[PDB]
Subunit: 219 residues, 8 copies
Amino acid sequence: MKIGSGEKLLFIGDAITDCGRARPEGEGSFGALGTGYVAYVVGLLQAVYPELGIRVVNKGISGNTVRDLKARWEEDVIAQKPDWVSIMIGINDVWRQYDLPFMKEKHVYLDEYEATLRSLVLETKPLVKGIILMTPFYIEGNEQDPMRRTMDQYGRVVKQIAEETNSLFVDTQAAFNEVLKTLYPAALAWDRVHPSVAGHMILARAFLREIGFEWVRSR
Amino acid sequence: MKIGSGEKLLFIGDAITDCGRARPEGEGSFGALGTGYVAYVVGLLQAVYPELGIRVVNKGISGNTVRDLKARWEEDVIAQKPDWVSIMIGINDVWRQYDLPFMKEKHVYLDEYEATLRSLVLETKPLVKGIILMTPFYIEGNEQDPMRRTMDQYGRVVKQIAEETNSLFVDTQAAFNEVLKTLYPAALAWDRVHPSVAGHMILARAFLREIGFEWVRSR
Amino acid sequence: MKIGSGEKLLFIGDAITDCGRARPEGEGSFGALGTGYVAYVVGLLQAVYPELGIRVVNKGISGNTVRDLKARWEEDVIAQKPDWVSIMIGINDVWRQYDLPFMKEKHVYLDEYEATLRSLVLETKPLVKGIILMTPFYIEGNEQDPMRRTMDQYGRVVKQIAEETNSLFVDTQAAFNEVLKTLYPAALAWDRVHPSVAGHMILARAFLREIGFEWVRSR
Amino acid sequence: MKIGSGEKLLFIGDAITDCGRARPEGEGSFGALGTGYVAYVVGLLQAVYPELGIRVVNKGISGNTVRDLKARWEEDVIAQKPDWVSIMIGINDVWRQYDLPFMKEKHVYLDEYEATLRSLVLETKPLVKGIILMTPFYIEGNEQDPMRRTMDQYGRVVKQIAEETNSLFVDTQAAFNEVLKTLYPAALAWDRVHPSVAGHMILARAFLREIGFEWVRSR
Amino acid sequence: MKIGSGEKLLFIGDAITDCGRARPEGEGSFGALGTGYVAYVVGLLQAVYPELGIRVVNKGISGNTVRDLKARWEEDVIAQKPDWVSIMIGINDVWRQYDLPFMKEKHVYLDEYEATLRSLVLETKPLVKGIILMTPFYIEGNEQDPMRRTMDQYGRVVKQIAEETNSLFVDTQAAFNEVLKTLYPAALAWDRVHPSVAGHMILARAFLREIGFEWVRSR
Amino acid sequence: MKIGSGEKLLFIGDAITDCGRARPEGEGSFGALGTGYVAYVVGLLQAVYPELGIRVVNKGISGNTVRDLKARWEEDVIAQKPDWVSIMIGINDVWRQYDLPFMKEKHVYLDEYEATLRSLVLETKPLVKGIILMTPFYIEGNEQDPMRRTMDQYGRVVKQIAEETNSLFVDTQAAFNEVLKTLYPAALAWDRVHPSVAGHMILARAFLREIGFEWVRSR
Amino acid sequence: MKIGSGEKLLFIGDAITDCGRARPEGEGSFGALGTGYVAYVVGLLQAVYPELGIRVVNKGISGNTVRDLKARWEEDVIAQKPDWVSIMIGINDVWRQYDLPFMKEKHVYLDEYEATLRSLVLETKPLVKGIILMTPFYIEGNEQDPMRRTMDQYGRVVKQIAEETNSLFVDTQAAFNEVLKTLYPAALAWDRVHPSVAGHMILARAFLREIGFEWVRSR
Amino acid sequence: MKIGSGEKLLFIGDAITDCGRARPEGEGSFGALGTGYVAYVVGLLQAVYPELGIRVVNKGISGNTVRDLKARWEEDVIAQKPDWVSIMIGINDVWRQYDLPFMKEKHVYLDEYEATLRSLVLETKPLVKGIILMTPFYIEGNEQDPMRRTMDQYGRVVKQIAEETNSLFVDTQAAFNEVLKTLYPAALAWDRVHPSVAGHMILARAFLREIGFEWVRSR
C-alpha cells in the first residue's frame, strides 16, 4: 500500500470530491469527509487497514476549476502540510464551456488548465511524500460526444503532467467506461457528472486500486 | 388562432407540463399553472389575445407515463369538459428504461404506449373541439444516443396517431434539434430532460405556432 | 436584430427587472436572471436566435428609484463593461409619492428624476454600443388616475432623454394600455405594478419588438 | 351602546373580517380574533366598557363570497347562538368579476347576491337581538372606476336590505371616501382591498359609531 | 390637536413601544410601526385626521431601560430630527429589580432613572417642538404590591420631570387602574406588563387624549 | 421511600405536570417525561435509588382542568394500571375565572371541582397502592390577591380530600409561600404560574419529601 | 457471486439496515436504500457487476426487535417475493435490556428471540433461493462487558440457526472484533451501535465476502 | 454552606457544563443557564436557600479541552470577577485520544493537562474567594476500559491540583461509579459521556454535597 502509517492524505477537487464535507476543516471520522468517494476510501482503509493510522482531509469545493484551486492552494494544501495530495479537477473547467458557452471568463481552456495544474503539481511535489493525480471524467460512453471528447483531452494532460512529474495516476474515465459498456449514463448520473453511490464506489475503487489497496490482505 | 373565445384548453403530461402547478385544480392567472411552458403559453395568449377569454387548466403530474395518464383520464380530463386537450407524454415511459433498466414495471414499451395513447385520443376526440399531440423529446443531438433513438421511435408514433386521428401535432424534438445545432444539451438541460426558461420557451413557441398564434396580429 | 453576436446585454431597474435574480452577479442560464421579463427575453432570444451567443446580466434591485441606480451605477453597470444597457426605472420614484405621501425624502420628483436619468444615460452612452430606455408604467387604464397621470409624465421624460441622447425607446405604458382596453387592472396586477406572467410577457414582447426580434425569422 | 352586558357578538365576512383569526372557533382575548378591525373593536370595547363582558367571535374566512357564507351559515352563525351578528360581504363577489373575468363560477352577480344576503338576514333576524350590515368597500375614489362602480351597486343593496329588515347599517365605502379626499388608495391598500392598520381603524371606528360607542363615556 | 401638519412624531421606549417594529428605521405605513399602541395611534390619526400629514417613527427596543435609551439617544432620537418625541420608559428599570433581584447591574435605580431621564429631556427640549412623557406602568391593581409601588414611584419622577421641563404627560398607570377596577390583571396581561390588543388600546387612547385627539371632530 | 421496587408511578395534571412530555405514552429515560418537576423527580429517584426500578409515566396535558382529567381518566390513568397516582390540578380551573372571566364554560367552580376530584380519587383508590394529591398553587404572596385567594380555597379542598381518602398530600402553595418571603413572584414566574427550573425544583422537592425520599440514604 | 442475474435481494433489520431508507418501498438507485451498508453493497455490486441487474430492497426499520420483524414479515418480506433475504436483528432485542432495564416489554430474551428468528427463516426458506443471516453486533472489545456478552449469546444462536437451516451466515461481531484490536469503540461508534462510514463499510464488506463478491473479478 | 450571600459563582467546562447555555453571557434565571447540572444546582439553591442571593454564570462550551479554557480564561473567567469558580474539564482532553486517535493535535495529553489546569488554578486562586475542581468522568464501570482508566488518571491530577492549591474537590467519577453498581452505562448515557436528567442530577448532587448544601436545613 503506497500510503503508510501516520501519514496525512489530503484530497482536493470540485463537488465530486467535496460531497458536503465540513468547511473549512474537512477533517474527521463522523461526517466531515462528505458523503462520496473520499469518505468511502477512508472507510475502506479503516475497515481493512485500521492500524495504518492515516489522517484524511477533504478540501473539495463544489464549483471549482483549477483556477480556483490555484487561488486557495496555499491555505488549503501547502499550509495543511500533507504527506499525500490527491487532485481531481477538470470537470468544471470543461463543463462551463458547454453549459455556459457564452460566459467565456468562466471557461478554463486547455492552455490555462495544463499550465496551472502543472504549476501546482511542481510546486507541491518537493513538499510532500507523494501526489495522486486523478483525471476528470464525464459519464458518457460516446467518445465523440463533444464534452466527453474534451474531457478525454483534459485527462491526457493530467496523464502527461503525472508522467512529466512522476505522480500516481488514476484514470477515472477508464473506470466509468467499463461500466458504461452495460449501463446508460442516466443509470449512474442524470447529468453525466454527479453520480449515485455506485459512481462514487467506481471512483473510490479506482483510487484504492492505484494505491495498492487489497480487499483481503495476504497473508 | 385555432382556439376560440370562451373555450377551455387543458394541458396534460409529466413534469415538463406540471412545473409545480397547483394541485388538484391547476387553474388561475397568479401561479396555479406552474412556471414552464404552459404558463408561458397562457401569458402570451393573454398578452396578444386578451379578448379571447380562454380558460386554461394544467393537469401535468411529474413522473407520469402514459399508463399513469390513462389511470387518471376520466377524472383529470373527461370530467373537466375541455374544448381542447394538449397531451405531452412519453419522456418517462422511455427514461425509466435507461435510468432504472432493471425496474421493468416502471417502463412502458412502445407497443403498450401506442395503444394506450390511441385509447386516450379515441375516447376524447368525440367530446372536444380538438386535440393537440405534442411529441416527447430528449435534448440530445446524436440520433444514435440510445435514449434519443428510443425517444424518436415514440415521437414517430405520436405523429402517426395525430395523422390518423386528425389531431393537431407539435414535434418538440424537431424544435430542439434546431437549437441543438448550436447549443450542447447541457446549455439547455443538464439532465437532457428538464430545461431552462429557454427550453420552456422553445416548447411554448412550438405549441403556439401549431395553434396559429401570431406574434403581431394582422387583426 | 439590434443586438449582435457575442454582445453583453445588461438590464437594470427595480423589482420589475429584478424578479428574484441572483445577487450580486445576476448572470447565467439556470435561474440567476429571475423569473420575469428579463428571463423571458433571454429565453426567447435563445429559442429563436441560439447562435447569437449573447450574454445577459440582470442588475435589477427591488425598491430602487433612479437615485438608487446612480449610487450603484459604477459597480453594477460601468464595471460590467456591457455592450448594451437596458434601463427601466421610475415606478418607485413615482409610487412613493402616492403610497408614502408624507415621507418626502423617499420621493424622487421630476426634477431629480430627469436630471439623474439624463446624467446616467449621458455618462453611459459613449462607453457602450447601445442603450435601451424603457418607460416606467402603471397598470391602470384611466389617464386621469393621479398616479397613472404622473407615471405618464415620467415616461415623457424618458422619451425625451432617449431622443436628446439617441437611445432605443420602449413605451411599456402603451403596451399595457392596449391590453387594458380589455382587462381590468386586477386581472394583470392586484397592485397595478407587479404583474402576472402575462404582464411580464407584455414587457418582454415590448422589448423584443423594439430590438427587431422576429418570432419566425425570414427566410 | 347597543350591545348589552353578557351578550355575544359574532362577526362574519371575508379576509377583511378574518385577518388570520383562529380556526374554527375564532374566540378569545390573546390573538384568536385576528389582527384587524374585529380585534380593534374588541380592544376598544374592553378599554372603554370593560364591565360589559361582551363575548366576541370572529367567523371571517378569507376568499368568501356571500354564496360561501350561506354554505356555512347554520354551523358558523346559527349554531353559535349569537345575540348580534355583523356581516361584511361582497368584496370578493365583485372582485372576481374583475381579476378572473373568465372564471364565472367565482362571480356572484348582484341579483343572486341580494337574494342570498336577504336570506341570511331573514333567517337570522328572529334568532338574535340585532344585525349589523356592513357594506363591502373598494378603496378607490373614482366612482366610475369599473370595480368601484360595481361595488357601490352592491353597497346600495346592503343599505336597502338594512332599511327593509330594520338592521343596523355601516357604510364602509362612505368612511373610506372621506379619507380618499386626502389619500391616494395606495397609501391605504396597494391592492385597493386589504388595508393598513389605518384602514382597519377606519372600519372599526365606523362599526363602533353605528353601535353607539362613546370614546369618553358620559356614564 | 397638539401635533400639526407635516410634523414628525418619534416614539421611543422598550418592548411596549417596539412591538416588533422594523429595525433600524422604524418608519412607514405597512408594518414597520409594530403591532401595538404606536401603530394604533398612527392608525387612528390617519383615520380621523388624514390631512394632517404626520410622519411617525418607532424607535422602541425590547429590553431597554433608560440607560439603554441614553446610549442610543444621539443616533435614534437627535439624528432623526423629530418634531415631537414621545418617551415611555421605566418598566424594565423597575422589573429587573424584581425578576433578577441579584443581578444588580441590570437594575436602574431611582437615582439613575431620574438623573438620566431628566438629562435626555433637557437635552432634547430645545431641539424639538414638543416632548410627550408617558409613565411606565404595571398591570396590577394593588398599590402595595411591591413592584406596582415602585412603578408608581418611577411615574412620580416622570411627572416631576414633565413639570420641571414643561412636557406633555400621560399617566398610563391611571388608565390601567380604571380598567383594573373591573378586570383582574391576567385578563389583560398574564405577566402584568405585555398586554393584549385591549391594553394597547388603553395606551393608545391615553396618548391620544393627551394630545387633544377627537374621536369625532367638531364641527 | 413509600414507592416500592418495580412499581409504576403515574403523574397527571396540567402544563406544570406536562412540560412538553411525549404524547401519548409519556414514558422513558431520555426526554419523554418533559423538562419539569416530573423529570426532576425521576432523575433524583434514579440518582439516589437506582435499584428501585420505578417506572414513571407522565400524563400531564397543558390547559387541563379537573373536568378534562375526568374525561380522559379511564384511558390515561385506569388503563395504565399504575401503583401510585399523583394528581396536580386546579390551576386552570381557577385561572380561567380570572383571565377569561366572561367565557364561563372554561371555568370549573369549586363545588364541581371538589366533587369531580373526589370522584377521581374514589374510583382510583381501590386499584392502586397509593395516591398523592398535590395542591394547585399560585406564585403570589398576597393572600388577598383575588386569584391567590381562590387558589387557596381549592387547595384547602384538596387537603380535605386527601385527609378523607387517606391519600398522601403535598401542599405546593405552602412550599412556594416560604420562598415568596424572599423572592417577588416574577423572579420565579412572570405569569405567576409557569416557573423557572427553581420553581420546578420547589415542586419536585415537595413531592419527594412527601414520599419519604432521603437526599443521603441511611440505607 | 451467489446472487444471480435479475434476482431480487431484500434486506431487513433495524436502524443499521434502515439508515434513512425510503418508506415504504425502500427501492431505487438515487437514495431510497438509505446511506449505510445496504447502499454500499448495492454500490459495489453495481460498480463491479453492473450486468447482473440485481434488484435490491431495503426493509430496515429503526428500533425493531425480532418481534417487530415477525409482525411485518408477510407484508415486508413475503409479499415482496424476493430471491434472497438478508436478516440482521438482535441489537435492540438486547440493547433495551441494558438502556431500559425496567421497561421489560421492550426486551426480547434469547429464548423468544431464537424461536422467533427460526420461525422467520423456516417460513421463508421454501419461498426463496437463499437466506443470509447476519449476526447482531456490539462495538465493544471486552467480551465480559455485560452487553457484549449478551450480544455474543444472540450471535451464537444466529450461527446455529444458519447451520441448521443451511442459510448463508455473516459474523458481524467477528468483523468488528478484528478492527477493535486497533481502535477503541468510540472511534467507530460513540454509542457502540450506530457506526461511522467505516463501520458500515466493515458490514458491507463482511456481507459481500459471504456472497462471493470479488473486488477484481477473474471473469 | 460554603457559598455565601451576594456571591457570584461561575461554572466553566465543556458540553456537560454548557448544556445549551446562552452565549456569551451565560447568566440569568429563565434558561440562560442551560438545561443540565448547572441549572439544577441553581434551582436547588434557590429552592432551599432563596435568601442567599447568589449570582450564577455558566461559561461552559461544548467541545472544549483545558487548552480551550486557557485561550478564553481572561475574558470568560477573570473579567467576570467571580467569587467562586467551578471547573470541570478533561472529558474531551481524553475522549479525542480515543475517538480520533490519529488526529494528535486534538489530544491534550496528561502533561499538557496538568500543566495547563495547574496554571489556571494558580492564577485564579488569589483573585477569588474560592475554587471548586470537579473531576472529569466517564460513565463506564470497568476500571480497565482504556478510556475509563485514562479518565481516572486525569481525575487524579485534578485531585492533586486541588490539594497542591487547596481547592474544593468533587469526584464526579465516584458519584457515577455508585450508580453503575446497578445500572449499565447505556441507561444513563448511550455514549458514556452525555447523560440523561438522572446523570445531571448525580452531578448536581455531587457538587451540592461538596459545598455543604442541606436538602432540609437544620433547624
